[PDB]
Amino acid sequence: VEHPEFLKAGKEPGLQIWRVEKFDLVPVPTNLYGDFFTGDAYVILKTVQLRNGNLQYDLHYWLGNECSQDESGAAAIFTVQLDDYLNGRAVQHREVQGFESATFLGYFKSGLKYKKGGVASGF
Amino acid sequence: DVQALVIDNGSGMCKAGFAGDDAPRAVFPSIVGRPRHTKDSYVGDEAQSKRGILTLKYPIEHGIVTNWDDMEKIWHHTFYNELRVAPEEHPVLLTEAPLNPKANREKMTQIMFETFNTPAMYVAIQAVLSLYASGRTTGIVMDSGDGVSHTVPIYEGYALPHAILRLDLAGRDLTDYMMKILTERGYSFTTTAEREIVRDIKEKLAYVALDFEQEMATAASSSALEKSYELPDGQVITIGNERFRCPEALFQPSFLGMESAGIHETTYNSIMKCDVDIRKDLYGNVVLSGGTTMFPGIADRMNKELTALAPSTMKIKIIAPPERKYSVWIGGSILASLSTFQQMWISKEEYDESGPSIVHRKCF
Numbered sequence A: 001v002e003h004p005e006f007l008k009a010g011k012e013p014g015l016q017i018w019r020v021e022k023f024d025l026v027p028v029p030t031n032l033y034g035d036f037f038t039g040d041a042y043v044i045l046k047t048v049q050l051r052n053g054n055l056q057y058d059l060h061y062w063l064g065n066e067c068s069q070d071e072s073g074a075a076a077i078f079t080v081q082l083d084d085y086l087n088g089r090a091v092q093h094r095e096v097q098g099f100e101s102a103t104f105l106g107y108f109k110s111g112l113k114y115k116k117g118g119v120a121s122g123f
Numbered sequence B: 001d002v003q004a005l006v007i008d009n010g011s012g013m014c015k016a017g018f019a020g021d022d023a024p025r026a027v028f029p030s031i032v033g034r035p036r037h038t039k040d041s042y043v044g045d046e047a048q049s050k051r052g053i054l055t056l057k058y059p060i061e062h063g064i065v066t067n068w069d070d071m072e073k074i075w076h077h078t079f080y081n082e083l084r085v086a087p088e089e090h091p092v093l094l095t096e097a098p099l100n101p102k103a104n105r106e107k108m109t110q111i112m113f114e115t116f117n118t119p120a121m122y123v124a125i126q127a128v129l130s131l132y133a134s135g136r137t138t139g140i141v142m143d144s145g146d147g148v149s150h151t152v153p154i155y156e157g158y159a160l161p162h163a164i165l166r167l168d169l170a171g172r173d174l175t176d177y178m179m180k181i182l183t184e185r186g187y188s189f190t191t192t193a194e195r196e197i198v199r200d201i202k203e204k205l206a207y208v209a210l211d212f213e214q215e216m217a218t219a220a221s222s223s224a225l226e227k228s229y230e231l232p233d234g235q236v237i238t239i240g241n242e243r244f245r246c247p248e249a250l251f252q253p254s255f256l257g258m259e260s261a262g263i264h265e266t267t268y269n270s271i272m273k274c275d276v277d278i279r280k281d282l283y284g285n286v287v288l289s290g291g292t293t294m295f296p297g298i299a300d301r302m303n304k305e306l307t308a309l310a311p312s313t314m315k316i317k318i319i320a321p322p323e324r325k326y327s328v329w330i331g332g333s334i335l336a337s338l339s340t341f342q343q344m345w346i347s348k349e350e351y352d353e354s355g356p357s358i359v360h361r362k363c364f
């Protein structure tokens, strides 16, 4: 499935973050990278440059403590879809607020932050 | 903007609704009733309440459709009477049991397009939808409904076929078992209305003991575990250790004279059939789903049993969502609602062009 945001996904080394918003994958403004709404769910793609010129991928779906079932479910499904889109080359990581992996936390130079709130559920 | 429908066909209950809703609009028994001796047929609640003059049939056994004419009747009723929609106006997501025979997948597909003229459809594995509903792409789902129980290991969104195991023991068998042990206590429940009472007793007062033995000990020594149940007239019965002896069969199928292993061992066995590299992720994400996993105490007991089977270093995590009775349907509601669903379904065009077999390439 070729979603507009999928076309942009993992094109070059770097970090891309999208927030689930009413059953869709919405890009997060770059200036806000690291500020996570605890009532939301997000999808993070870390693209790393490889020897052969091909990129290495790690897909992380972050789940806020108050995110609704539709958001966490959509985060999980979008992750599988992106991975499929990237030819199954991404390692998927489930990241739960307050229990994030060292790898994930390390993506944020200044340290990631949590803010209360988020977009309403799509149900 | 089109509205997709979600239909979860269960052996005992069918769940139908609209994609985008957080719960099925209709839940009803999977039964087709027809004049036993001589409307021409009924489905669901009405068939059940008119059982006095109808002969009831269950088209789905162990999660697999065994009678296509009756299944069609159930779907027809679902669209026109339960959901009150014209199927030709809606993409339809249907669910299937793990390891659903190839022929059935094609039949389901053929019926939707040819009989119902759906503009588009999709078939998802029940267990996988349940995992998604829990917000995970990896884990092992323990799905136990009315007719069968499955252990389904899933990695990065896809079930692992070779590791799926099946336990032919589920809600129906527990209800029947409750009927039997209740007679030892003198209570005879044999009619349909009586079986309903027994089912209600199972759903209302049964529970899984953390330690069975110790629980029997307890029950035999004091009247601490007994509970009262008021029957439909006014009679009040007293239920003792039957409350936990009933669901205990899930862990000790021998209670039903079955040779197979209990649910905890089946889960452990499925995990062991998977690559060592991903077993950690399975032990840490055991997701329970289905009506039969609704007994209080089942999570704790599964945690205990799995912990005893796995190395002590392995972190065991049993996830038991309160909404597990409908996890599959909810998972389907979410999937069908995605801005990307649009492309994943089989369209009428594709069906006309490739025929039923297209389901093998677009739904896997």
Ligand SMILES: Nc1ncnc2c1ncn2[C@@H]1O[C@H](COP(=O)(O)OP(=O)(O)OP(=O)(O)O)[C@@H](O)[C@H]1O
Binding pocket: B009, B010, B011, B012, B013, B014, B062, B063, B144, B145, B146, B147, B148, B149, B170, B171, B172, B175, B199, B202, B203, B204, B289, B290, B291, B292, B293, B294, B295, B325
């Ligand atoms: N609170 C409860 N405690 C125990 N069992 C319950 C509870 N609520 C429902 N059940 C049982 O769960 C079963 C129905 O479950 P479910 O809807 O998941 O199955 P199904 O979809 O029809 O079956 P299958 O997956 O085998 O096709 C019945 O046996 C019912 O009595």
Ligand SMILES: [Ca+2]
Binding pocket: A039, A040, A041, A066, A067, A068, A071, A117, A118, A119, A120, A121
């Ligand atoms: Ca939210």
Ligand SMILES: [Ca+2]
Binding pocket: B009, B010, B011, B126, B145, B290, B328
């Ligand atoms: Ca089911």
